[model samples]
Target chain A: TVTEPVGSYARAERPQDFEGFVWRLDNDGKEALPRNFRTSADALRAPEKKFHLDAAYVPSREGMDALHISGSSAFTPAQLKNVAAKLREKTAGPIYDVDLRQESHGYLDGIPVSWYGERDWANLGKSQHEALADERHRLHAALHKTVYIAPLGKHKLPEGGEVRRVQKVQTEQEVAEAAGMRYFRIAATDHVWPTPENIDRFLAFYRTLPQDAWLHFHCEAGVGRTTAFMVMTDMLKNPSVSLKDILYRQHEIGGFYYGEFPIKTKDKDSWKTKYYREKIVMIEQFYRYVQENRADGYQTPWSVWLKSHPAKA
Target chain B: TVTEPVGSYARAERPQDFEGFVWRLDNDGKEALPRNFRTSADALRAPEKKFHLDAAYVPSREGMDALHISGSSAFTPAQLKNVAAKLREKTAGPIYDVDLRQESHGYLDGIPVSWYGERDWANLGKSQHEALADERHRLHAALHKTVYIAPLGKHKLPEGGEVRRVQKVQTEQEVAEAAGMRYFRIAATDHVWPTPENIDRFLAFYRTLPQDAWLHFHCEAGVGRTTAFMVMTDMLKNPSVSLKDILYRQHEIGGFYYGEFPIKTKDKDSWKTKYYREKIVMIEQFYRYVQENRADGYQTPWSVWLKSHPAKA
Candidate 1:
């Protein structure tokens, strides 16, 4: 019974094996397509079927969306509002709206506006909590439960059809623990790949969260480091998925997994060797540490470790 | 009389004096103008005014006649004939017509054509002898005297004009006796000026010849060397003519008497010093053997040696 039901409630109605389950939804209706997280194997095996979810999604959508809708930056605020309105009309259920205006802690027009001490604030300062709070709040207020908006700095459940703010913290664990409530973290470039510190944070957060929790992770641009982390996490938990399958799924989600196009693997030896080498090095290190510090033969997952240690320096 | 007669026939009339003595037939009764060569002194200084009887008499009606003509070189045969005709028409006398075309034995082409031993036959070829003889016969016949053409080197002179051929020999006394003529040797260049040989020749020629004998003397260009000779001769006979008169007469006779042009006697000492130093040096080295030897009294005129000696060594 160690393998719990792995899908959402929408997938529960189809009483089939994992392969059959993917085919049924893939051919559900005219609008049905592959899910953003689904592998190409699943899509190819049921080419005749369709699904409702976008094939891929941006890992930092929640953060970017919040910033974009707030309209505090130099970008067209009206255009962002219109996009949000259209998004609101397309989705189902009550959306979680995060209001960033009242909860923001920084000032963009003043000196020292960078949230994480990184410069180039022309894009970030306008989109960060300081300048974007108001519009994010307005979008949240409109989308309700059908869309979720993480407000700045706090772990509060967004009211249906209302926006809220969620401030970025230091550890991935903190972000994951506040996942069901919709939160974001301004991770560093080093946090892009799964280092021991990030892995621990991820494990602590995943262990603390419920299996049904709809978690969202994000970073600036949300492609490079975030995509790397997502691929690494998927590979560790889903051992049956091939590296190629993970790479394809990553491309579907946001064009490219590591924010870079994959080199050709027609003659697979060299590319396979490189991919395996990177994977084995990271996995072996994690496995060795966990095995050496066996706690009553119970191994902790990376997501569980992340939720418990929010700022575990 | 020791002094020549001052009869109208003996004294030559100047061209300007002809206005009172003669009438111009071409003028339609108008009074004649004074010609360039006339003066009141001519009427008073009759003894000194005696002209050469053997040559054309200047200041006469014949001399006053002008032929309208222009160009370089001496007049041509036809032009000379015209001039003679004009002279005949102007003067009434036993007018001797000198035909230069047939009578002159010297070169008319104006360039030396042949070298005969040491002498150069300017234009006279072998055939030129008959023509030269004819000229000499003509001059003798016209003048009614034994007229001698100059520079006779086995060449003939034509009839009509006199040819006076003077030759150099080893001694002045001997040459004068042999030629049945007067001998006057002179320093042809500045080097022999005031020399013993020059004085000796002057003394010998002056003693042997009568005072009234007409002597013709010349050197190249008939200017420099000849003027120097004239000066020395006049100085030897009449010591009264000052060096100033010598220079003045030199200028009157064209330009300079020696070297090339008249020397400035403003500073007499400097002028004499320069004449002795520079001008004398060139002549001493450049003149022919006859000129050089006679200059120092080592040799005499050629006529004396030619009589006793058969041929030149």
Candidate 2:
């Protein structure tokens, strides 16, 4: 019997339950991951109400095996193990996940943890304190499910993990770190472009990585930021494809629209229009920059160039 | 007699006309340029109502002689020549200007030119056509001054430049390229951050440049983008200082406030508040990324990191 993705979770072995926003990239069969590949409906399990992972299987380029795209849904401890296993099965390579949350969200024994909360104790900043307070409320209720909250103080886990005193909070970053995922935090707000400097830093960081490992990217919901980045990665790996095509392809398969905002009957400069317009321009500008970067033999880096030429008011 | 900075422009020999947003960095005397360096008042001139070049003397890092900062006021052909001469006099080195204007504005025989206009031929895109029409109207009036408009055909200039069929337009990029400045366009709206891909490309581009040449940056006005970049470069060269200190130091010398948006009365999430809040967070995020970049021993590049780890919605 087929299980609905609701309170309980079931993994589908084929693309039965996996429908929207989920697709695979084979790079025209240059690598292993099948074109239009989908997780089996039996192995394809996602949180109820949450669409299955906005994950894409991009065959490796620049020597990497393949690339995986997902968001927070893929990183919950159990989900992490599940997704990782699926990825390994598909690509048959080690997966190297790059967590892109500048905030905090990790898991401890399948329990959600937010280091952003624990960062603020009694004497911490107001923002951090409020965040922690809310999280404390969340975990207190979550505590009734299964795992016991570690009391305030140092405690060793049954596994070789230590729970240092952060007022009985489990920090997910620690758990994610232990799981071997590299955290390349991008402190960015929703629906906004990141600063030029961070973009440069990310690019520089990515360039040094060995392409042999399967790459994974996950944010919170895994669409806005994830889609933009997925398009960018696609561009980087497949320079021949137009940005519009890549965006449309991704959009068709359940990614966010990377195109112009729909014209909302006059009022061209409405707040929503302005917001989407900026997003489109940002992506378009990036496409142009990448073209130039490849054209110039990649001598000048993004940060160095960006610093020399910051945004004008 | 000293002229008030109202209408007339004059060059200061030694920081006379130079004030506000103009200070040089010598990287603790590692390079040739002096710390706390200011342009000569006799040599420093700015447009009426505009501060003298927000220019700074940065000693060369990574082999480059030193860096300079200014805006569009430094780019008018006459002003361009003047500023170039002053930079050469100070650094005694060839100055390489990185023009970071994704829009359009260049010089032709001291006359302002805009390719953004001519890009809109009669059959061109609506946006471009309107831009061209506007430029045509503006130039028709400007024709009274000097310089005859080359009809919509090929015309050779005395200085080995050609006026192509872009309709009497004196494109600046062709002129600037002839003058040896590299045009690294950044298509960004005012007060908004650029995409990560562009930033990575810029960093990649800068790394490949030889360090012996003096570097310069200029936009239309320059302060917003220029200041942020100046701070970034400062961080790149001097990772020891806190981002706050760098911003403060830059602000003291006339840069934009790179700190918190001054809290308004009561309403913390007003439109203005949201705008400035994003700016502050963006800069702060960049600061953290730079720190991480330095700590990582410069192995990973920014683009690669950013693409695989996009933003969350």
Candidate 3:
């Protein structure tokens, strides 16, 4: 059974063949195989740097720049969702499957190949579905909470009016452990600036999930806040990585990573204001907390220095 | 004394006319008097509606809206906020002020005039400020809860994997009660559909605050979700009033009432599947709840029969 390409909410997910895997089978047999893989690589990377850039956006296919990574015909919303649920059920290990692609091969040893058994792990970005399903992903509990964290949960009406708690029995953690994955849930509304309270919680949330496994982060579409958090997390770990590089890298790979710097928001003097300020400055504050005071053993700062300046005001 | 028009986070607080005294010294004398009152009325109706809609949209603003309506232009954010802190500090009664607005005049006779001092008692809407100021507003507690109720407050990031809780200490009501008002905070998120949980909580919240006085309801801006709730609460009480009539009345007076039907979301088709089924149907369900079941000794059907149909697929 020849499989087809897949659609993903995250375009970053389109093709991971930044290298490797290109030596595999190609359509034109021997001649076509290398050409196909090469072309596929060409489209996905910047010609010289050859780093991953979405083929659709940059121009080139993975195989000889000729390999048209033919996507499976559009998955109807039902199909998109159907496969998403299926992927969650089937994505057992750390590297989960997103329905962005399906190898076109028929079979290896047996008779036929299926999209159901394919795997392609690219960057550390997952669509909102994957993030939700990550709960089912059982990896080292360390990575689940430590490195892979989606801080910035939510701010319903205000800072504190009533604390909202889920009445769901069989906690999300228990459910994830049962599903063979590591995941936790925070009440981050789809879009809005992450609050300082949450910034603190995320610090706590991440303490448990270390870098033992392929940690994932996500939000709807995988581009918006997900990128911001991903960038922050990256910046936090790799002190040398200037905030600028990672943010640029985040957008380069994530494509749709819409978090703007200077900090993008509607009211900012530029693409920077409370939205960007709230999210970005947190890192600096987080850094400051651990700065000369590293001896203090920094936790997330409840109120940031920037907040005193307040991007909103 | 010259008065500057006040800026309110509560758009619901545009201007309201205060009757009784106005003899001091108009720049032009008595002839300029009616114009001020009329101009005040002109701004307030649309403005209050404008503000309540935000309380409905923004998470914190609703509480702020409630805060402002407690005021007169007399209370600036500082003044509105001052009275707010003061209400929590001093006063105690069934009514409260939210600083939704400040009154225009300084005094009547030698007494300081106040929005708290004046009462139009038009519709069910006031900011947290107004609710507190309503202290001076003495009506039966029956109207407060039965008609005026703000069923959603604030939540953190866990209630739904979101920590659900109000950050404020002392209940919104307790602080409100200190200000001489009946108030409670429910955890309804802004813009998103109101959950079944909120529907039930609101019922309980409303019952506790009954009348007692100028039962006002507001969110930020006063026109968004607050209007929807106001419409629902109004409809619930006035069985004779058609839902349409109430909605129309809500809009005619509560102008910016923008709770888009069919739901405004990215997944129109999919969300339509849900919103159309869930939110749109809520009115009918609400209508049905009171319809023939009115005599079933109907107390709000916590889970309306319609909820079983669940808008979400």
Candidate 4:
């Protein structure tokens, strides 16, 4: 029951090789993807990361090199090593690992591959669960010299209930220490969007980073929260660019459409507004964040700006 | 805090005028929209339908001049007449009205305009509630030569319980009779995607339509179930075009991304699969529907075909 690819709408024609997958926002505010890298399949293969999972390197149009943003399907230790080493080969600077996952894959460790068949396991020789476990072990093998833990996920259950935060953060920190890596903690929420307060705090932390630092950001699937941080990083570094362009460029590289909101809408009571308005408003506020600082020669830092223009509940 | 439009991602640059709003899948397997129709605002306006509320004139690239579909918000009688008449002016056939709403707008009629400020009503001089009431009266005034009632909606309350369908359908039928129009009832659920049994039943009813029939199909927001019937009608008329194109062309004119399901995903227990797999699989089955009949020269009627194929439980 398979069909050949038809028009441009066909999925098979999308560019997903590692070269095509890595996009860079150049110093001239231009976005381009390289086409000479290896196929993504050679590095890691997770079903969710199958298509648009990508690395976005935003080069500072100014003096600093800015950041490198990436995500995965929660790679196995071997797969992580393969991809991480490939990234190192691709960049000029040392990379620091930042884990954004709120939930632990701990339950997956001892689970048998056969048990996940019903759940449609990755079935890639070993289950994806095994890969997650494997990657944790690789973290202790000096795969990354320094690890940062920000369990910014407020994971909700399938039944539409919120998951507890304390234990998940503790579990994440335990893993970081168990690997003998220095861990920096930032409290996080499960909502895909970060609070303005947290964004301010993150910016303060970002301001202290060395000019050539390469920060590798990852969440579960790497599209949602990871992209939020990516956009924030771009906003902080490239204040002159429009937020919409920043978002669309990410989408061009196969990142999720963070600005997927209705336009021909103004009514507050509609379902579209109910589901999307908050996010849209947040983006607008972020747009304002750059505007406020830009208006004053970028002198008023985010921490101070946020104090007077506090976020609306 | 406004920015100039940068690239294709800018929403302001998209086509939305009424002439551009209507699309047709030509007999040569091509899709095109006109550039000379009235503005969508001149007819009806609702927050949700603001961007993509449209009419599709699917010509019988075959023998019969197949169908015309239009959806508006829950429009006022004046708004409904304005849009219906515009569709009537654009087509060479009489338009029959079909209501797909599962919830009653009765509670909205007498509500004061000022009370809606908190809810953000369409404060176009009058509240949107007033327009809905006006449209109900227009239904009886012969704006549409005939009206069909298919309360094919199992509306769910905001707090997450399914509303009782029996009374809603009864009230809908009562309105049809009150307007001196005949009413037909089709049982519905609020799952957004229709059951195969219901879709089969809908096709059986569609087979009885006259070649030049213009169906003014409408649901509350006009995107979900309304688009479903539009695609179903197109499939019935044009059997050769792929389903992805059928879904995409609809999206080209502001319709919701019905194929919004995540690709590169196969883990059955993943959240993306849990949320979207059913709809994706259903679309595949719909693709199969045209295929099964096409292979047999479309000789088997839908009712008879459904019996032999017996939809999977």
Candidate 5:
């Protein structure tokens, strides 16, 4: 919309089919998209080729994941498989994927999108890779016989043909297999607080996933829920990694690998990107809360408090 | 070798412990390597982090592979997987990883280097993202249940660890299990040549992979060989996509994704480089060859002939 005339376009509502909920395209921007897309309500697709989706995979650690493993939602099956390949190569696996954000696919600014409120809308694709990884986790589970864990109570698959759902199975074991992975989504949200019951229910699933060990996780744009989860898990341990390394390593390599990834030293500029600063704070806060609640011998107290506090946003 | 000094570092032969064969470091004399690397007869390893390897994967049809995908040997299991993640994300699958360059891990004058043709050693790592993709093709073949087709008869894995050999199964009942893939490979030789024998042999394999359809692919440094393979495949496929487009997409995405898989896209400025010139000529020659060859009947042609030509390097 920045490219358009002021007031020429009406503020449009989000698309029921994609992600990036906060974005607003120029008026009729939705109409400007490809035809098949005009009618889409479900996200079971990914960009046909590598468009820019600033997300990277953690191939190894200490070798910690090269840098970030921030995956929120909105990834096609192939995209997720790509992430899985990266994970398997970096660390030998039998991984149990953790999905922290609620799944939703919609459109923002006319570009197809998807996300979990844990991150911002503009760059959710950064985290979508991980969510897809979790999506594919089901297929891999079927193949490798690994344990299958879902963050949500139930998940679904894309329907048999043009009958696609406006969304995914929030979590699923059989969905991607049928979707053909023609489309996928990414974005951010959820700065809002849910009631204690909401937090409790969510934690109930978290309890099954376990933050204490090695878990491949993420959230929209990789800066929030993903980092928060990483922090909770690592600080519980020690010599924890800064989100900085996680991010760089998650990037693609080639000529600039030296400059882009550099050594494991702290980000040279530490120029403080909103992305870098945002989630790490949340991570620290969550860590404190987790520690505080554990002290009370009641594992779920932080959820209630988080519901009441919501995020300062 | 571009930079030199008084006691000029003895023009060191390539580092046997790494890849990139033609590279040499500043005349630091041959004394600039790590203590552990000072003594080694083979390329036993690859850079540890998301090190650069100048390579890109061509994942579609009527489509060509990017200009580079040269991932010579020396990549670790981790590095290879990272490349795979990139390939799957960028293109689709059933990638035919090509390793026109042999597997060699060594040290250029001083910095670590791994590749074939001895490119000015010091910077091969620069183009490694694409290159690493090629390097990992070997491993992907090993893991994917896809065909591990090699033009050259025998290859070697990094000398450390399991001391694996180059021929990771001349045959398999479908492998590369968790890698989530299935595809084919091109002929043996230098990723060069466009003869009847080479054509047929490659086609035999191509028949297995389907250039008329889709296939994700790679190579060490992923430039010459990967590009050549893609050009050939695409041209053969019809109202084919432009080799130029392939090269451009092969580039990175930040600030336009240069400092990237760059050295790609000619965009006029490219006219100044050997890489730019070399490929256009190849594309033309290949165009003529295909026209001529098809006229000769039998559809695809020679496999052994490719060995003699060896990619005009």
Candidate 6:
């Protein structure tokens, strides 16, 4: 019964394009597919089912002088060179490329990302685990930097120029500034349960910024967290946009990934389902973080500068 | 050295008035008279001070109305009729010619004035032993019913209300209707220091009413608790009024009776000084209470109600 083709299995069997698959997971869950499989291997093996995964692609800097990139590891020196070449080809303003990992030093691209005596880890191990830990430092350091470059994952393209890695949870002052570029960090697991604090933080942050400032946000596998954050931001900031438009745009980005790993049973004769649940929880967390830390009027030491100087267009 | 007078003292050898035989007490506690004593007897036999204790005369009808008294009393039928006839001749309103001391319920009037509970001798005795215990409640209850009359002392007058009493701090709902009377219970003592919770509770209680309801408040002698409560309410409702107005009014009404004894000391010799000290303490308490509980948007429930409903012309 699990293997049986319910109806129109041919269409279901074909691998869905990025938009269809991620959007399906975002809107619906695994049930959005034609058939249910406990394991990714089962789904893959089944002729009546196919999965789609989202990928990030920075657009050519032609019409909009913004450089968008995705995937934490996607932008290597070669990729950066290609991005720089593309910017040159488009002739949309000057392109300056800086790698956070290489330039960390005692600080994260200067601006005192870390206070005195903070542990430095930008030069740590190469595995994804090491990279993830280092990514936090990178994001913190980026906050103080005059410029930032963020990689994309399952979300939209990353924009260049004074980029700050913003999470769903942000202070009101941070979000209020509408100038330059800011990247919202979305994790795959956040969608399941969005905390109120995160949501408040995001609102506060968003309220401080201009309406049209470019916002680049993303998650791993390019779909869930990215889409969720985008949808929420769109709903709150641009109430006029219909839900349908949000859903459509989410689909256009890439459908979320839903798959499982095949593990051999103790008997070694049959395969068992090993489902990986990540994107929803991550996106939900980001949403909650944004909600919780919405900026209040109280000024911090960092905001002192802003208080003294008006925003330069 | 202490005997030397800074200014000329008029020596009325045989002082005709008490004011003329004044002696100055030095800081070192030495009392020096302006004129030397001729004989030991003359020095010892100081003229008795005459005090012009004045009471504003009210017509019998007015007194009866003010006291809420009726002519019913325990007297011989003929005697009662005669007294009533005399009272009728003097005034038009109901007669309040009852001799309370001779009445069967004379014990009710003899009960010492304690703050709360039944006004009986037993409670009064308990108060002497445990002066601090239930003091706030006792004072709250007593002030609610009886006006705290204060004499012009060292403090200014305009700050004090002419007639002060502990008002029942009622909830908004309690005072919602026209005929509804709000009763505030004296929950605790808030002398110099008050808990934030108490402050918040009072404010919350105040916020529920429409602005404009007059608040009746008093402590033991209408200085401390009354002034504090009034200042707090004013701060919350009438932001325009200056603190000077509050202080001036309080002093005018009752000359700083912060620490005055509510009852006369059994030994009348030191009662004046003791009562004066008591009054000063009470005023001090009022000052402290006002300073401690001042916050934004703090209003009495009555005042809050008035804000919502305009006064009836």
Measured by TM-score, the strongest candidate is 2
How good is the docking of model 4, as DockQ?
A: 0.01
Would you estimate the TM-scores of all the predictions?
0.21, 0.32, 0.28, 0.30, 0.24, 0.20
DockQ per candidate: 0.00, 0.00, 0.03, 0.01, 0.01, 0.00
The candidate 5 chain A region of ten consecutive residues with least summed lDDT is A156-165
Residue A307 in candidate 5, Cα distance off native in Å: 77
lDDT of 6 by residue, B29-119 (tens): 1222111111101111212122111123111211111221121112222322343444344344432221111001111111212212111
Model 5 per-residue lDDT tens digits across residues A1-313: 1431111111122322223211111112223211121100112222212223334433224533332222333343444455455444444424334444444432221122332221222223334455456334432332322111111111111111111112233232222223221111222233212223333444454455433223445443343344344444433332244443323332222101111121221354232233333333444455455555655545556555664544432
> How does each model score on lDDT?
0.28, 0.42, 0.32, 0.39, 0.32, 0.28
Candidate 5 — which residues are off by over 4 angstroms? Answer: A1-313, B1-75, B79-96, B104-178, B182-200, B210-214, B239-279, B292-313
Q: lDDT of model 1 at residue A247?
A: 50
Docking class of 3: incorrect
The residue-by-residue lDDT of candidate 4 on A279-307, one tens digit each, is: 54556667677877766655766556655
Q: A1-313, model 6: which lDDT tens digit per residue?
A: 2341111111222111111000001111112211110111111121112333222322121211121222111121232234334334433332222112211212222211211010111222233344445445544543422232222122222211122322322221132122122334211221222223334444455556553343434322234334444456544543444444433334433433322213224433221111113233333333333243334432322123223332211
Place model 4 in a CAPRI quality band: incorrect
Candidate 3 vs candidate 6: the TM-score winner is 3
- Candidate 4 residues B70-113, lDDT tens each? 54333433344455556656566555555543322321121100
| Candidate 1 chain A, poorest ten consecutive residues by summed lDDT | A17-26
Better of 2 and 4 by TM-score: 2
Question: Model 5: per-residue lDDT, tens digit, B1-313?
Answer: 3352211121222332233322111112233211121100122232222325334543232222332222222222334344456545645435433433333222221122233322322223223344445545433443322111111111221111111113332211022222344424332223222234334645565556442223434334344445455545545543244544333332221001111222443354342244434344445555545554655542534333323332342
Residue B123, model 6: lDDT of 22
lDDT accuracy of residue B209 in candidate 4: 66
The lDDT, on a scale of 0 to 1, for candidate 6 is 0.28
DockQ, 0 to 1 scale, candidate 3: 0.03
Pairs of colliding residues, candidate 4:
A76-A131, A77-A135, A153-A190, A154-A189, A154-A190, B19-B37, B76-B131, B76-B135, B77-B134, B77-B135
Q: After superposition, how far is residue A12 of candidate 5 from its true place, in Å?
A: 77
